[PDB]
Design a protein around this ligand. Structure first.
Ligand SMILES: CC[C@H](C)[C@H](NC(=O)[C@H]1CCCCN1C)C(=O)N(CCCCC(C)C)[C@H](C[C@@H](O)c1nc(C(=O)N[C@@H](Cc2ccc(F)cc2)C[C@H](C)C(=O)O)cs1)C(C)C
Ligand SMILES: Nc1nc2c(ncn2[C@@H]2O[C@H](COP(=O)(O)OP(=O)(O)OP(=O)(O)O)[C@@H](O)[C@H]2O)c(=O)[nH]1
Ligand SMILES: Nc1nc2c(ncn2[C@@H]2O[C@H](COP(=O)(O)OP(=O)(O)O)[C@@H](O)[C@H]2O)c(=O)[nH]1
Ligand SMILES: [Ca+2]
Ligand SMILES: [Mg+2]
Lengths: 68, 440, 424
């Protein structure tokens, strides 16, 4: 029974070390994915707002040519 | 064997890096070209200095070190400086555009473009090791690379190296030399992210080193060069255990056992003595009792806090030079008799001691006197929490208004990471309070 | 290296632009031919920031010269320093501007705009590591204001992750009789609050009052005003141009100076004021209303952030003591909820004619006084529709004036919000 317990201890040590590596790897994967999509969302909104300025700037130039 | 790989991240880490290696070369009799005349085993060996230096067949002794910065200026000075021959070019890694004092750019935006390259070069050093002990990480809390890139690196090292030991030397920010209003944000973010990944971290308060330079070395307005030479001595005393051998040398891992009662309580306070000018050290022999007693004066600490208003959970004393056991035993017995040091009730009142006989060295044209003997005390005291408290307060002041947060949100971070990081620091401050309460 | 790309637009923009290049060229030891004749390696170390390197060891400003009038760009070529600029960087119009923002932003400016971008694109593409862009202009005219802010917007599309920096000259009735400038300025601030990272507020009301009251010039010229603008511009770009730790690039400066993204309008200052001191005096003069290039009393608000650059051979211990002194004695005027919000740099190399000098860069809530002044003038004519046909004629709606007014007054509210906030 003492030999089975010695085995169980060394397996627990290996398993906890492996679980720590695993969670570090998952937590880091979800952080970097979350950051990428957040940053792309912020630049998309920046340029989609700058493109609304281009639509408005052509409405101003076409409104001029509707005073002819 | 028991090799250590040193990693120097960002300006602070790199420049403290230069001072440390320069100092190690002078201590081991290694020249700026890497040749070491006193070493008769050419090509390799397992002498104590081989924990920090590998060896080429050509007789060159090469630091087991990677230097990383997201910006080429500081490392370019290493690449063309006095010690350029010491390092292989692959050990000196640089990007183009820095992290702009933003944790988010160091960890996510800019940092991710160079992280796989850095692990590659670290792996090349690891594959040269017969029995890798672990890593020493040098970095600022305040900078964007020092905070953000170091965090990323630490997370990745835990994945790629399991539980190999990882020690930090972390530069804690001071108003006298700071270059960023957001340093408190970066300090809290990196401390939170790194806490689970670091086995032992030595904080170096720049304000403390600044004061020691002013007060003890008569330096008017200290520069990084001044600060760094003194930091190097303290780092040298801590690593001395690994780099030398001797009958009374206690290894850094043994001090670690006494210093870390619980995994999160891994921030030892370092105190160093004597820090004295050549002019004052003339016709003045400072005894073992004198320098030991100087470890309990808070003016000589690496972090500004007061251990006399806290409780010790460990006390380790790392002597170097002309020091013999009789003198050390007598000095520590005086500390006991006089008291002035309360331990928590759950901790034995021990003083774990080591001695290396090689005396302290100084760099040419430095401020420090060459003394016969020196000591670095490493203590675990509840008072170190004061450093977190000061920083956590500055964090709160700005974060209640969300001041500067848009710079972090703009690089992909959420407010959730800030408040999560601050909760972990609140929990850390409570841990240092809890361990200091007496048992029922 | 960290390259900046300079743009000067309109009459005012090209005057202060030209004089900026005179002053910093003298400092780096560059003569009008573009050759180095100096004595110090520190002059060249960060020369790539503003100058391209050419064949035959020469140095060319990374500068793009723009205006809708062809005349001002002849006068740039004329006055020595002028044969230094790159000939194909000169992008000129024909019609001229007419102090009409709509013309500069929508019609006449839009036609010329792509010719400017092509030059910007050529300069930007051979940069090793581009920091971003520096525009000099006035907000009272038509080209510098309307086409300048169009330029800014069009450069953000193609370089969204670079820094956009402006030196924006604000209109004063004391300097210009043009009635329509409150409209031009308000419309320009509407653009700047959204599309720039950091804007230095060069205020002609402040510049005239320094020249008339302090300097005692009974009839001040544009050249008298621009001597003050060029002193400021040398001063606030010192950290970008020489080696150092503090605010050494445009992004690091922004991160130290801009706590909230809309609040990026700085209030520069300078001592000594001159025409053509000890560290305690320099330090006192910096935080005093008389020395500010915006017409705002800093003791009517609080400073969110501050940068202080001291130039000359002085004691760094003395500078540290005085900057601590000034914060202790003026603590109320620094927001308590941003700790360590005053940063200090010291540069050994002084400017021309002085042996020591100080430059000040303040993000002050008192800057609202500038925007209120402009907003009172704007609304004085907008409540009775005066001269709107100039703008409606080019196709603008009456609602774009309302939206511009409303955003500038929001900006005033936001300055007041953070002025009144506390640590509690
Ligand atoms: C009564 C006319 C004078 C000349 C005018 N004052 C006013 O308009 C007053 C009176 C009514 C109440 C309020 N206004 C502002 C004036 O003194 N001005 C404005 C000029 C308006 C120009 C017209 C065409 C709209 C001053 C500028 C004027 O004196 C000039 N300075 C220069 C000038 O600086 N020339 C330099 C070169 C230069 C040329 C053109 C530039 F745009 C800039 C520099 C060289 C000279 C030698 C120097 O170094 O000072 C050219 S014209 C202001 C600073 C108040
Ligand atoms: N002791 C010491 N501190 C330094 C040194 N260089 C910078 N610091 C401190 O480190 C912090 C600034 O961070 P840096 O290390 O310069 O920044 P970085 O890691 O290069 O990050 P980025 O520049 O943002 O990419 C401030 O608190 C400085 O006071 C140094 O050589 N020695
Ligand atoms: N400080 C200063 N202000 C100027 C200068 N030239 C014009 N201004 C001001 O700029 C505004 C008109 O802008 P201007 O550059 O002439 O218009 P543009 O033709 O559209 O570029 C007015 O408020 C003038 O007082 C100058 O050289 N220095
Ligand atoms: Ca050997
Ligand atoms: Mg850096």
């Amino acid at each position: 029974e003492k030999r089975e317990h010695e085995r169980e201890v060394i397996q627990k040590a290996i398993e906890e070390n492996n679980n720590f590596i695993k969670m570090a790897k998952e937590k880091l994967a979800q952080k970097m994915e979350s950051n990428k999509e957040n940053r792309e969302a912020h630049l998309a909104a920046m340029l989609e707002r700058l493109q609304e300025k281009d639509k408005h700037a052509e409405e101003v130039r076409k409104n001029k040519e509707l005073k002819e | 064997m028991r090799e250590c790989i040193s990693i120097h991240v960002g300006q602070a880490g790199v420049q403290i890096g230069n001072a440390c290696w320069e100092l190690y070369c002078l201590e081991h009799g290694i020249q700026p070209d890497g040749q070491m005349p006193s070493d008769k085993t050419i090509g390799g060996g397992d002498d104590s200095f081989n924990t920090f230096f590998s060896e080429t067949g050509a007789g060159k002794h090469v630091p087991r070190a990677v230097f990383v910065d997201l910006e080429p200026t500081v490392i370019d000075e290493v690449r063309t400086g006095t010690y350029r021959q010491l390092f292989h070019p692959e050990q000196l890694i640089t990007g183009k555009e820095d992290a702009a004092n933003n944790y988010a750019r160091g960890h996510y935006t800019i940092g991710k473009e160079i992280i796989d390259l850095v692990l590659d070069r670290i792996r090349k050093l690891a594959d040269q090791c017969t029995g890798l002990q672990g890593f020493l990480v040098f970095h600022s809390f305040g900078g964007g690379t020092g905070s953000g890139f170091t965090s990323l690196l630490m997370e990745r090292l835990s994945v790629d190296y399991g539980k190999k030991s990882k020690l930090e030397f972390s530069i804690y920010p001071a108003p006298q030399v700071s270059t960023a209003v957001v340093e408190p944000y970066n300090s809290i973010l990196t401390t939170h992210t790194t806490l689970e990944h670091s086995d032992c971290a030595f904080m170096v308060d720049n304000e403390a080193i600044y004061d020691i330079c002013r007060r003890n070395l008569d330096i008017e307005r200290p520069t990084y060069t001044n600060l760094n030479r003194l930091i190097s001595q303290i780092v040298s005393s801590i690593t001395a255990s690994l780099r030398f051998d001797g009958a009374l040398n206690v290894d850094l891992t043994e001090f670690q056992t006494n210093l870390v009662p619980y995994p999160r309580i891994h921030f030892p306070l370092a105190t160093y003595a004597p820090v004295i000018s050549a002019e004052k050290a003339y016709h003045e022999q400072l005894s073992v009792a004198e320098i030991t007693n100087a470890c309990f004066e808070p003016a000589n600490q690496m972090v500004k806090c007061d251990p006399r208003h806290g409780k010790y959970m460990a006390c380790c004393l790392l002597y170097r030079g002309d020091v013999v056991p009789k003198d050390v035993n007598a000095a520590i017995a005086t500390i006991k008799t006089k008291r002035s040091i309360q331990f928590v009730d759950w901790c034995p009142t021990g003083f774990k001691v080591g001695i290396n006989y090689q005396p302290p060295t100084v760099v040419p044209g430095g401020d420090l006197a060459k003394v016969q003997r020196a000591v670095c005390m490493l203590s675990n005291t509840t008072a170190i929490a004061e450093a977190w408290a000061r920083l956590d307060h500055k964090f709160d002041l700005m974060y209640a208004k969300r001041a500067f947060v848009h710079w972090y949100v703009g690089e992909g971070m959420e407010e959730g990471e800030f408040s999560e990081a601050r909760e972990d620091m609140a929990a850390l401050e409570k841990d240092y309070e809890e361990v200091g309460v007496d048992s029922v | 290296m960290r390259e900046i790309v300079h743009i000067q637009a309109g009459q005012c923009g090209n005057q202060i632009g030209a004089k900026f290049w005179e002053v910093i060229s003298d400092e780096h030891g560059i003569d009008p031919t573009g050759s180095y004749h100096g004595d110090s390696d520190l002059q060249l170390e960060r020369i790539n920031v503003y100058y391209n390197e050419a064949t035959g060891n020469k140095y060319v400003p990374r500068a793009i010269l723009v205006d809708l009038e062809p005349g001002t760009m002849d006068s740039v070529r004329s006055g020595p320093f002028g044969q230094i600029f790159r000939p194909d960087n000169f992008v000129f119009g024909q019609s001229g501007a007419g102090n009409n923002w709509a013309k500069g932003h929508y019609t006449e400016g839009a036609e010329l705009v792509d010719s400017v971008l092509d030059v910007v694109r050529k300069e930007s593409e051979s940069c090793d590591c581009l920091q971003g862009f520096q525009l000099t202009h006035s907000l009272g005219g038509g080209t510098g204001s309307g086409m300048g802010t169009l330029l800014i917007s069009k450069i953000r599309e193609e370089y969204p992750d670079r820094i956009m920096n402006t030196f924006s000259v604000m209109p004063s009735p004391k300097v210009s009789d043009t009635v329509v400038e409150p409209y031009n300025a308000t419309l320009s601030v509407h653009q700047l609050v959204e599309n720039t990272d950091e804007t230095y507020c060069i205020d002609n009301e402040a510049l005239y009052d320094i020249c008339f009251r302090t300097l005692k010039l009974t009839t001040p010229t544009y050249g008298d005003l621009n001597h003050l603008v060029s002193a400021t511009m040398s001063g606030v770009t010192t950290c970008l141009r020489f080696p150092g730790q503090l605010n050494a690039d445009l992004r690091k400066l922004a991160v130290n100076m801009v706590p909230f993204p809309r609040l990026h309008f700085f209030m520069p200052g300078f001592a000594p004021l001159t025409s053509r001191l000890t560290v305690p005096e320099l330090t006192q003069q910096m935080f005093d209303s008389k020395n500010m290039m915006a017409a705002c009393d800093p003791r009517h608000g609080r400073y969110l952030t501050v940068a202080a650059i001291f130039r000359g051979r002085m004691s760094m211990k003395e500078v540290d003591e005085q900057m601590l002194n000034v914060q202790n004695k003026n603590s109320s005027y620094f927001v308590e909820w941003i700790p360590n919000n005053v940063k200090t740099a010291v540069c050994d190399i002084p400017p021309r004619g002085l042996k020591m000098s100080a430059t000040f860069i303040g993000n002050s809530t008192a800057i609202q006084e500038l925007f209120k002044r402009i907003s009172e003038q704007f609304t004085a004519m907008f409540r009775r529709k005066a001269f709107l046909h100039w703008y409606t004629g080019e196709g603008m709606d009456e609602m774009e004036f309302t939206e511009a007014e409303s955003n500038m007054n929001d900006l005033v509210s936001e300055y007041q919000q953070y002025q009144d906030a506390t640590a509690d």
